[PDB]
Structure formats: structure tokens, C-alpha cells
Design a protein around this motif. Sequence first.
Motif, PDB file in Angstrom:
ATOM      1  N   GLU D 102       1.542   4.697  -6.620  1.00 35.60           N
ATOM      2  CA  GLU D 102       1.479   4.106  -5.288  1.00 35.60           C
ATOM      3  C   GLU D 102       0.107   3.505  -5.013  1.00 35.60           C
ATOM      4  N   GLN D 106      -0.637  -0.415  -4.278  1.00 29.87           N
ATOM      5  CA  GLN D 106      -1.379  -0.883  -3.114  1.00 29.87           C
ATOM      6  C   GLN D 106      -2.575  -1.728  -3.528  1.00 29.87           C
ATOM      7  N   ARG D 110      -2.979  -5.555  -2.328  1.00 32.56           N
ATOM      8  CA  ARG D 110      -4.137  -6.005  -1.569  1.00 32.56           C
ATOM      9  C   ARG D 110      -4.771  -7.252  -2.168  1.00 32.56           C
ATOM     10  N   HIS D 230      -0.063  -5.987   0.993  1.00 34.26           N
ATOM     11  CA  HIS D 230      -0.259  -4.597   1.384  1.00 34.26           C
ATOM     12  C   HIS D 230      -0.203  -4.435   2.895  1.00 34.26           C
ATOM     13  N   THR D 250      -1.197   5.954   4.851  1.00 30.29           N
ATOM     14  CA  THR D 250       0.063   5.252   4.665  1.00 30.29           C
ATOM     15  C   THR D 250       1.096   6.069   3.906  1.00 30.29           C
ATOM     16  N   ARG D 258       9.273  -2.653   0.092  1.00 30.42           N
ATOM     17  CA  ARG D 258       8.563  -3.624  -0.730  1.00 30.42           C
ATOM     18  C   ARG D 258       9.514  -4.661  -1.311  1.00 30.42           C
TER      19      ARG D 258
END
Lengths: 445, 27, 87, 438, 126
Positions: D102, D106, D110, D230, D250, D258
Motif C-alpha cells: 500500500e 501510494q 503521488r 493519490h 489513510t 483505485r
Amino acid sequence: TQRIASHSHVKGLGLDESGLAKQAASGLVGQENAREACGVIVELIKSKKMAGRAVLLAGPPGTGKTALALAIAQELGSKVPFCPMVGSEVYSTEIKKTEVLMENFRRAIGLRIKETKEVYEGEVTELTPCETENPMGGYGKTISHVIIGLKTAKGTKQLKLDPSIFESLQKERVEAGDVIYIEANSGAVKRQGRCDTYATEFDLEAEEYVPLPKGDVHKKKEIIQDVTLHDLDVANARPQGGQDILSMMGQLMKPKKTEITDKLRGEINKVVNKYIDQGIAELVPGVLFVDEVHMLDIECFTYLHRALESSIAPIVIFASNRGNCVIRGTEDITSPHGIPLDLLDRVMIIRTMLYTPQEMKQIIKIRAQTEGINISEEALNHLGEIGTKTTLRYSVQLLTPANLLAKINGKDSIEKEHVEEISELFYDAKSSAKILADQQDKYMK
Amino acid sequence: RHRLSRRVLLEVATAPDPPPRPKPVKM
Amino acid sequence: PGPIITYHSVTVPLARCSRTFITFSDDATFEEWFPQGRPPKVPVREVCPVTHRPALYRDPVTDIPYATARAFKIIREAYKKYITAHG
Amino acid sequence: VTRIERIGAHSHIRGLGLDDALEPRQASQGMVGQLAARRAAGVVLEMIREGKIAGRAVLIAGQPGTGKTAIAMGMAQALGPDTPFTAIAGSEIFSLEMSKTEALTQAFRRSIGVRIKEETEIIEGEVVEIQIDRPATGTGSKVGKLTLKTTEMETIYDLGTKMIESLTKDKVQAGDVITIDKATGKISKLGRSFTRARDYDAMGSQTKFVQCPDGELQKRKEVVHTVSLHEIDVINSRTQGFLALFSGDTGEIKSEVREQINAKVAEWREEGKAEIIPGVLFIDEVHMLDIESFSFLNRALESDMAPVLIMATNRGITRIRGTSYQSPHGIPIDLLDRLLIVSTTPYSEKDTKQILRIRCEEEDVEMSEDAYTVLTRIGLETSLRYAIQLITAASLVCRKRKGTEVQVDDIKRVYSLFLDESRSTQYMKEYQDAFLFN
Amino acid sequence: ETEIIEGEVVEIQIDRSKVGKLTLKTTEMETIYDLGTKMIESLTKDKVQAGDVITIDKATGKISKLGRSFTRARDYDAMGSQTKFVQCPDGELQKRKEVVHTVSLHEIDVINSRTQGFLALFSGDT
Ligand SMILES: Nc1ncnc2c1ncn2[C@@H]1O[C@H](COP(=O)(O)OP(=O)(O)O)[C@@H](O)[C@H]1O
Ligand SMILES: Nc1ncnc2c1ncn2[C@@H]1O[C@H](COP(=O)(O)OP(=O)(O)O)[C@@H](O)[C@H]1O
Ligand SMILES: [Mg+2]
């Protein structure tokens, strides 16, 4: 403050104006080269033009590494942030180790905010609109000012204000005889209760009646507020004071440290730059002291490379008394101070040496002076001889038991017999180890 | 200091109702 | 039309300055928002007639301020005597 | 005054220093030497700018102090703020709040930016006169009138109830230069064209004025909104996600969310609503990743939303974390097959001297030629970073003695005061028993 | 050290939630008080009525109910879990309250950690 701690005698680095270290000054004895290097580091911190610089204090235990760091902190002063930290603190049950390190980094960068708060205090004596002889539109009455009379202990002034304040006055239910304050920078009226001169002994209100304000009606002062980047980060990550459901949940739920994102930190950096450019704030980069750095694991050491390579990082001071030890988090990897060579390549190493018997005697005398203990010359020599064997910490830790024993015996000074009795009563590490070795069968494990 | 006792409770229970409170008089 | 409050902001020469005006359609609204109340009066510091100390209490039955339990007992005795005499 | 950003390790690096043909200059934009590595970085940068190939991985490998992070920072500075650049360390993915996969996801997301461009009608002018009539008592319909002025126009606007409320909340007065967006009704004050009346009290010190806007009143301006994948994932994961954008926290975002966001962004791209701006993720010290993270990287680079991945490592044939397997660079061979490796050669004497000169220029330190020679000799003998630190140390020592130029004596003084790894290790061997363990 | 008012409530009159009067008594004293808006609101929130023995902090205005006085008409057959009958206080209506207690630094930390942090001093969920 009144209690005497282990570094209570360290008032700074005993440096001459030229940077040379005096033999005994400011509570420090010996360690002249390390003290000079720490003075150079203090100048580096004060220059405020370097970021991410790292200094490692390397030496045997009981050689003044923590004392030197605290002397640096004393030299900087309370204005400069100084965030002490032990390596074991990165292991938290709430946030990751890198987050703890980043938070301590932001704790070391301080911000000083200077603002002028101008207020008008007084008890409302008069509340009179300023009508216009020519009403706009022909009908009704038009007003161009509202005269508010404010009375204080040593004066009375009248203020011709904007007509729009009539709504704030009605919302605050301001009437004559009430004490209010108006802020210039905002143009808002706040009713801080009614004057106490209109209260009788038979009234039961608690927060309604207030004393008549002292001083002048117009009060302005310069407010200096010292904050750190971590303070802003924490106040923005878990905000307190909202009336929405999220603030209520935050109040209800148990507080918990969270992994503050780079987005919030970048926003905080932008706000800090804006404040600096406006002239409101001045950046105060301080020091992060990480004692027992060897307790960090390989992940923390690896993260420290990026942490120190940043252009916002403070000046970090490390300290380690380890030799060729195994790095934590690695299997049989040995490095000279328990620190991988990649991080040692990024630090300047300051060496602390062992103390000669004369320096040990001087330090013992200083500690006795700090603890309010009178010690005879023969007792001091015997205790320094005790410190030649055993360690220095044992000798400085025998001072207060011996003083208590002397006081019980009815003497105002420590004699040699008191030190001998205390040495008999309390054992050092080496004597205890000898006892354990001589009786290893009778002990456990 | 101000815990009730059985004696006080019994005395209050057995005693008649207190006289009506006098009306306020501006004096 | 109706009873209204007119908020007015203008640009006027001083080369220009901003001024704000508030116009009330009727005098009733102007009086309501601006009662022009006179300054309040300082209450008289009442004193206990029995002990002459500054008053701290007010017996509801007699409306006589007092500052001592003995003063209260004396006041209530006087009230009882007044009831006995006048009837 | 000192800004929040000060002189750091790579503060002198303003770019890769290449020409049009991606031929590295000997000394330009802070970079010195590393010609082949800088050329490779420039090719990778062109690939990033083209933004057509997804999931490309580059490994910058070399000895410590050879300029791997310098090259990464030069690439970041040459890209510019328009293209996302997420730089993280390998240790940062080990988190108690989320899984390693995870965290890596992320980090990838980003590094991709979604940009939405739309045109809106905008009114910008100087307020001349504002009049608002409201009922004296009780609920009623407020009626108002607003006058706006430019250098070439002046219009009187009849105001609705909600615009009246907006103007009342913003406290718009005469002389305020305001911006009104017709759709949302948002009003932003950007200055005052002139002062308020002087006769008023409790007003404060009047600031500087703002010139009145020119041109037509109601213009049409292009508004650009840019967020990363993100941020979309976080604000769509839960109602409180927007606060998670700042507090972290989060958790683990559902794969369904997603997938929906990927589908919607693809739909926007096909419909011309949004453009995707792929960026770079830079993982420094990638050798701290374990085998599971590398295995996730293997297949996560096979997505069309993946950015360019740049890794730096100074490891030789080393054990992979979480296993007992020896591999080059500490990286499994399956991931090493998916990436191009850029080697950095060590610096010579002249390159070291030029790097020292650039560092001294960055730090505003004046040094003599003999001092440069001595410092270069020290840097060759000990390390480049030690010489860089001695630059500032000798600057401070020289300033202490009321000097202006760093001499050989100052360099010798700071060499005596501050130790490198080699001399510290020697002195620790001399007193091995005094140190605690081994 | 805190100044308090301590007495039994005799009458509560409120005119209209704007202004009202409160009558308090001891075994040796009795007086009437003029109430404001916040005092009236606090009295209505705590449902203070006649026969209740209450204390009021002069500085903060907080009202805590000690008990209610016993009369012939208050011979309840069932009582609430918090009601208890106490004697009317003696002495003077105005009293000084002195409280001396020993707490640790950890307890103050837990108290000031969150809004109701004193609950963690029981639960341990610090
Ligand atoms: N040169 C010195 N002068 C005065 N006091 C010292 C000196 N060196 C150590 N001390 C004192 O002796 C004690 C030893 O602790 P310290 O040497 O700071 O531990 P460490 O070596 O882990 O930093 C400290 O309380 C310190 O205040
Ligand atoms: N070719 C170069 N040009 C300019 N500066 C360099 C160069 N190589 C290294 N440096 C500087 O030397 C310092 C250490 O190099 P760094 O890139 O951290 O080594 P590593 O590749 O091990 O990360 C950095 O501050 C960097 O700015
Ligand atoms: Mg690097």
C-alpha cells in the motif's frame, strides 16, 4: 530547577573570546579540543546559514558527551530550539520510526513571530450615532459615525467609529456601563462583561461583572511568540476547536500520533516563507541532539541520509560510546561506532578523551560545590584515588551519601572516614562483577 | 457533619407540618 | 416598500476616500437600535443596621440587609415583636 | 533574513548541465564530471518529458559520494515544478498504518498528476458604490445594488439574495478590488484602490494600494486544477479523506476505489476533460526494501499509470533483505532485469577541486589557491563530504580570527578539530577496551 | 482555597428566563439573591428546586447539589440512585473551601492529554 541533576553544573563551554578553551571554566574541566570543536559548532548554529549538518560526539562512556551537548545548548540559549532525544524513542506503537525522526527534525526548527496587538479598552459611557443633516434618499435618518465613549482607570476617550459597528454592538448586546474591547486589526467589538461598580453584594452572577480596566484606553504591545514547525504540523494534522462532526470525533477518540504527509509540511513551509517575507516571523534553526544513536536500527540510519540531505533540516548532534559494534537491524555487520559507514561519511567526528586524575579531582570538587557539600582536602584526594580505579561517576555519586553520613555523625564537612564507610557500603561495577564471578554458581542464569 | 440520623428523621416525620412562610414585608 | 435598513458605501474625494453610511427608513428602528440609554446609577452600599458592617445578605421576609447571624436573629426578633404589637 | 530553505548538501545543483544534444559540459549548473551518468540522466529526463512510456525503471549505482543523489537532484531541478517528483527513502515504506504494498502504491500514485482545465467567466473591477437594503425586522428578501469600475468600463449590477449574502460575508466596501466568479459566486478581495476615510477611529495602519484593473469587466479566464492520483484516492476513500490528505491516516485504500479512479481518469483523458502528467518516483537507498516490496515493484511497473522509477544504491553483491540470498546491488535479479543501470565513476583531482570551488561559491566562502590544493588533497585522501564540511568549518574559524580568506592554517585547524572516519577508527583502536562493545 | 455559598433552596422565582431571584437559607441565616441569565440557565440545567441543598462557587458559578432536605411530604417509597437526604447546613451562607490532595505528574498528564482524560486514569487507555 531547584533539584540538582547530573549536568546541573554545566553552564556552557568555558571558551575565551578567541575560541581557545580555558582549563576550567563554566563548570567544564579539560576536554579542551572537544570544547573548541563544540564552540565552532555553536558558531555554525548561530550563523543560521547551514542545514542538515551532522556532528558525532565519539568517546568512551563518562567523557562529557552529554555534558558537551548541554554546554552547546547553554551557549545557544533558550531562544534557539534544542530537542534532546535518545535513539530508543524512535520505536513507537503509534507511528513509524521515520515519522518520529522527521517530527523531531521539525521540532528542532523554530519560528519566532512578532506582532503588534492594538486594542481599545474601556467602560462604555456613551453610545451616540452621528446623524447627517441631509438624509440620503430624503426619508428616514442616515448615520455617518457611532461615537463610543470608553472609560478606564486613568483616562476617558471617545472613538468615532464606522457605522457598521452598530450590528456588532447589537449582537454583543453592548449597553452603557459595560466593559468592551475593540481590536484595530479586525474592527470587532467584544463585550467582556459589565463593570463591577454596578454590581451589588446581593447579585449571584459569576462571569458577568469585571473590574474597571487599568491603564490607558489605547493599549498596544509587541507580542513575541516562539513556535516550531512541528507545532504547526501537529496543530494542522489533528486540529482542535472546530464545531463540525470531525472535531467532535477527534475529541471523543483517543489522541494518536499520525504520519504527517509531505503535502501538509510543504504547505507549512510555504506559510513560514510567506510570514518571513512579510516580516512577521524570523526563522530560528536549532539543534537536534540524538543521544545513544547506536540504538537506532538500519532503517533509521538509512532514513537519516535523506533527512540530513534536506535543505530544511537542522544541525544534528549525535553521540555514541560504542566501539566496533554490530548495527541494529543487520545480521553480523560491524561498524566503528555502531553506525554504518555511509552515515559516518556525512558527519564530523568530535573525539572525547579520558580524564587524568587531576581533572577528575577538579570535576569532583565542582560537583561538590554544586550539591552544596563541603569536602576536606584529604577526603577529596581519597575520592579522586577512588575515581582513578572504578569510574568518575562512582566518585561523584559517593558525595551525597557521604554528606548524609557526616550530617548524621554531626559534622558539616565530609572527612576521609565518611568516604571510606560509604565505599564499604556501596559497590562499583568492577567490585560487583568480581563478586559475581567468584560466586557464579550461586547466582541465576 | 450533615448526615441525617434516624432520630432526626423520625422527629421530622412525626412532627406536624411547618407553619406557612410569612409573606415578605417591606421594612 | 417597507421598514428597511440601508447600508451604503461610497467613494468620495478627500484623490478618493471610502465612506460608509447606514440609513434607517423609520425612526422606530433608529430608536430600537440606538436607545441612547443614560449611564446607569451606582447602587447604594447598604449597611447592616445592627452591626454597622457593610451588608452582605438580605433577609427576604424583612427586606433588611444584614451581615451577621446575630444580626439576623435580632432582626427576626424585632419582626416577631412588630407582629405581636401591630397584629 | 534566512528562508526556510538554506544551504544543504545539494543546494548548488540547479540542473544536469547539458546542452541541446544532451552532451554534458565539464562544469555547468553545479554538476562537475560524471559525464556518462549525466548523459544517461538527460536521456531519462527526455523520456520523462515525452511522457509516453509507462513503468520505466532506472538504477543509479556507484560508490558512496559519487553523485547519485546529486544526479537525482539535478534531474528533479531540470524537470521543474510542473511535473510531479516524489522522492522517498527505502525505509519510509515500513509503516504501522499501512502495508508495504500500500505504501509503494501510494508512492507511485503521488507521482502521477491529473490536470483539469476549464474556462470560467470572471468579473474583476473596482467597487465604486455598494448599497444593500434589508428588512428592519423578520425574514425578508434583501435587495441590493453594486457598482463596479475598470479603467474603461463602469457597470451597475442588480444583486440577488445569495450574492447579497456573499458580499455581506466578505464585507466588501468601496475601493476594494474584488473578483467574482459568476457560477459559484465566490468573491476574492485582492486589494484596496485607495484608503478609507481618515475620520474613522480604530481602523489601523492603512497598507499599500492596488491599481484598478483595466480592460473589460466580465472576462473569460482559464482555471487549471491539478491533483495527483493519490489525492483522488484519498478523498474518494472515505468522507473524512480530505483531512487524511494532511494527517496521513489513510489506512489501506480499497482496490475497488483505485480501479474506479483509473477507469474515470481514462474516461476523462479520452473525453479531453483531463490530461495525465506522469512524473518520477525516486527511492533513495532502495536496498532497504525487502523481497516482498521488490516483488510488488516487479508487477506494479507493468501498469499504464506507473511513473518512471529511479533508484539509488551503493551496495555490491549483498544479501537481499528478508531473505538469505546474495544478489547484485541488494536487488533481486528479476527486478534487475526490468531496469537500466547507470554507473557513476569516481572523481579525479580536478573534478574534486571544481566541486570544492562550486561548494565554496555556494557558501559564500573565499579560499586561497593553496587552501584549495590542500583541501583537494584531503578530499582525495579522506572523502569528498569531509572536505565539504571542512569548507564551512574553516570559514567559521577564519571569521573568528577576523580574517577574510580561508588559508591553509584554517584548514589544518579544522582538520585537527574534526576527524574523518579513518582517524576516528584509528583512535578507537588505540583505546579499544575503553569503548563498550567490541 | 475557594469561596463558596452553601445553603438550602427555599424558593426559585424566574420571570419572563430573563431575571429572577433565589432564596437560600441555613439553620442560622437566610438571604435572597438576584440572578442573571447564565445563573438562571445553570439552575434550570441542574433542575434545582425547593428543598435542595446546593453549593455555588462564587468565582465560576458552578452549582453542585449535595442533597435535599427531609420534610414530612418527602417520604418517598422509591428513591433515585443519586438522591440523598442531608441536614440543612449551619453557620454562615458564605464559606471558604480548602482542598488539599496529592496527585502525580502522570495523573496531570493524563488529565490534560484529552478532553476527558481523567477517564484514562481509570481505564489506562492513555
Ligand atoms: N569535562 C567535564 N567537566 C565537567 N563535568 C564533566 C566533564 N565530563 C563529564 N562531566 C560530568 O560527569 C558526568 C558524566 O556524564 P557524561 O560524561 O556526560 O556521559 P556521556 O559520556 O555519556 O556523555 C556528567 O554528569 C557530566 O556532567
Ligand atoms: N558530480 C558532482 N557535481 C557536483 N556535486 C557533487 C557531485 N558529486 C557529488 N556531489 C556533492 O557531494 C555530496 C555527496 O555526494 P552524494 O551525491 O551524496 O553521494 P552519493 O552518490 O553517495 O549519494 C553532495 O552534497 C553532492 O552535492
Ligand atoms: Mg545518496
